[PDB]
Amino acid sequence: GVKIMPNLPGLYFLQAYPSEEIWRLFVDGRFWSKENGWRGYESREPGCLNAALESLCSIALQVEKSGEEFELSVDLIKRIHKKCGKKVEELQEKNPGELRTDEPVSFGIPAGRASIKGIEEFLSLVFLTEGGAEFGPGKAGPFGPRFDKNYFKNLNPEQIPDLAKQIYFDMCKYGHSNTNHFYLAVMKNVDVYLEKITQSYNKEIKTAETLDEKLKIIVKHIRMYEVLHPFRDANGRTFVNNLLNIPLMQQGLPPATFYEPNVFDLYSAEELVVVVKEAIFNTVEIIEQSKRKTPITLYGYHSSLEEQTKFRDMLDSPSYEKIKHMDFLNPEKLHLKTQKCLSSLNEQYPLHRGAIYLSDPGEIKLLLSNRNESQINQQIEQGAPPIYVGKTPAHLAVISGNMAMLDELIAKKADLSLQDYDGKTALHYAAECGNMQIMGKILKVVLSQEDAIKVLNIKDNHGKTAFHYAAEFGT
Numbered sequence: 001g002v003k004i005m006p007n008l009p010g011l012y013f014l015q016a017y018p019s020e021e022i023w024r025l026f027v028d029g030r031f032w033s034k035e036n037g038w039r040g041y042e043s044r045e046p047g048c049l050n051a052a053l054e055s056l057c058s059i060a061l062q063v064e065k066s067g068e069e070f071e072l073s074v075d076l077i078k079r080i081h082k083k084c085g086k087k088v089e090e091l092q093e094k095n096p097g098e099l100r101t102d103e104p105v106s107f108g109i110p111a112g113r114a115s116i117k118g119i120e121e122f123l124s125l126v127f128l129t130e131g132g133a134e135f136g137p138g139k140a141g142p143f144g145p146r147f148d149k150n151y152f153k154n155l156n157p158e159q160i161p162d163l164a165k166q167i168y169f170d171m172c173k174y175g176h177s178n179t180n181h182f183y184l185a186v187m188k189n190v191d192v193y194l195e196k197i198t199q200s201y202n203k204e205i206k207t208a209e210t211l212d213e214k215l216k217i218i219v220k221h222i223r224m225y226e227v228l229h230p231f232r233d234a235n236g237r238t239f240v241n242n243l244l245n246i247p248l249m250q251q252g253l254p255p256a257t258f259y260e261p262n263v264f265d266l267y268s269a270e271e272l273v274v275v276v277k278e279a280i281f282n283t284v285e286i287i288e289q290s291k292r293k294t295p296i297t298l299y300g301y302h303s304s305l306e307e308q309t310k311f312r313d314m315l316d317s318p319s320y321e322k323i324k325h326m327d328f329l330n331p332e333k334l335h336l337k338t339q340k341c342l343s344s345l346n347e348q349y350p351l352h353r354g355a356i357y358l359s360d361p362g363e364i365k366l367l368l369s370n371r372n373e374s375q376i377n378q379q380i381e382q383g384a385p386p387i388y389v390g391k392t393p394a395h396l397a398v399i400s401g402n403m404a405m406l407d408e409l410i411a412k413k414a415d416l417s418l419q420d421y422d423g424k425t426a427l428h429y430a431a432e433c434g435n436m437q438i439m440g441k442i443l444k445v446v447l448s449q450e451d452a453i454k455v456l457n458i459k460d461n462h463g464k465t466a467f468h469y470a471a472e473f474g475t
C-alpha cells in the first residue's frame with residue numbers, strides 16, 4: 001500500500017563503496033599502475049576529484065530529496081558541469097555551467113577508442129552532419145586540427161557502412177594507440193541539439209521494459225551527449241562520470257568504475273552496454289574485496305599506506321559524507337538485479353577476464369583446464385571493451401601482474417611471441433612494468449624455443465625491442 005520508494009535505490013552501492021577508494025569512480029583504471037592511483041589525475045587539475053565527487057553526490061541527494069519522479073533536463077546537465085569546475089583553476093576560465101555557442105572544441109581519437117559499428121553510428125548522427133561537425137584524418141595544430149579529409153562534407157548515407165570499415169583500417173594503419181583522426185565539434189545549435197537529446201532520452205526510457213533495454217537507452221544518450229561536445233571542457237566528467245551514474249543508480253545498479261571511459265565517441269551503443277557492465281562489475285569487486293578485507297590489486301595497482309592517508313587528508317565533500325551516513329533494508333533484490341545484469345559478462349573472453357580478475361591458482365588451473373590452443377592464444381577483436389582489443393590472455397596476465405595466470409599459461413604452452421595491435425609482445429610489457437620475475441619466466445620459455453633471437457628482436461610500432469623498454473625503466 002504505502003511505502004518509501006527511493007528515487008535512486010542504487011545509492012546503497014555509493015554508500016557501500018569504500019571511502020579510501022572513492023577516487024576510483026573518476027580516475028580511469030588505465031592510470032592506476034603508472035600514476036600512483038589518483039595522484040597523476042589530481043596533480044593535472046588540483047581539486048577536480050573533490051569537485052567531481054561533490055557534483056555526483058550533491059546532485060544525487062537533490063534527486064533523492066525530490067517528490068517528483070526523476071527526469072533528465074538541460075538544467076540538471078548545466079548544474080553538474082558548474083559543480084565539476086567549482087574550485088578547478090583549469091575550468092574557471094572555461095565558463096562552468098554555460099554551454100558553447102560558437103567556440104571550437106576538438107580532440108583526436110586513436111583506433112584503440114574506436115570500433116567499426118561505433119563509427120557507423122557516429123557518421124549516422126544527423127545533428128553532426130547538419131550542425132557542421134568535422135571528422136577525418138589530419139594533423140594537430142596550434143588553432144585546432146588541419147583536416148586532410150572531412151567525412152561529414154558531402155556525406156552519402158549509403159556509403160556509411162563501407163566508410164566505417166575504411167576509417168577504422170586507416171586509424172589502425174596509423175597505429176592502435178596513435179592519433180591520425182581528429183574531431184571538430186558542432187559550432188551552432190548546441191542548445192537545440194542538447195534539448196533534442198534530453199527529450200529523446202525521457203521519451204525512450206519510458207518504452208524500455210527490461211534493465212538491458214534501459215541500459216541501451218542510457219548509453220545511447222550519454223554517447224550522443226559526449227559526441228555533441230556541449231561544454232568547453234569537463235564533458236567526460238559531466239556525462240560519463242556523473243550524469244551516467246544517476247540513471248544507473250535510478251535502476252538500483254551500482255555506479256561505474258571505468259578502466260577507459262574515453263570510448264563514448266566512436267563506440268556503438270551496444271558495445272557501450274558491455275563497457276558499462278565491466279565498469280559496474282569493477283565497483284562490485286572493489287566493494288566485495290574491501291568487505292572481505294582483501295587488499296585491492298586491480299589494474300596493476302597496490303596502494304601504499306602513505307597514498308591512503310594522503311587521500312583521506314585531501315577528501316573534502318560534505319555531500320559524500322552525507323551519503324556515507326545515509327540510513328541503509330534487505331539488499332537481496334538489489335544484489336540479484338546487479339548479478340542478473342552482470343551474468344552476461346562471463347560468456348565472452350573468460351581467459352582475458354581471468355588474467356585481469358582471478359588470483360586463485362586452483363580457480364585458474366580449472367579455468368584453463370580443457371582450453372584448446374586457439375582459445376589460449378585468442379586476440380580479442382575491435383568493438384570489445386578497450387582493454388581487450390588485440391590482446392592475448394598472456395598479454396593481460398603480464399600487464400595485470402597476474403603471476404598465477406602467467407604460470408598456468410606457460411604450463412598450457414601459450415604463444416608468448418604474439419604481438420598486440422601496438423606491435424608489443426608479453427616481453428615488451430614485462431620490461432615496461434619492470435617485473436624481473438615475469439620477464440625471467442618469459443625468457444626461460446623464449447630461450448627453450450628455436451626462434452629465440454627472432455623472438456627477442458621483435459620490434460613494436462615504435463620500432464623498439466622489449467630490451468629498449470627494459471633499458472628505459474625509470475625516466
Ligand SMILES: Nc1ccn([C@@H]2O[C@H](COP(=O)(O)O)[C@@H](O)[C@H]2O)c(=O)n1
Nearest residue numbers: 028041044045048233234235236237261
Ligand atoms: N584531472 C584529470 C581530468 C580528466 N582527465 C582525463 O579526461 C577524462 C575526462 O575528460 P574531461 O576533461 O572532458 O572531463 C578522464 O576520463 C581522463 O582520461 C585526466 O586524466 N585528469
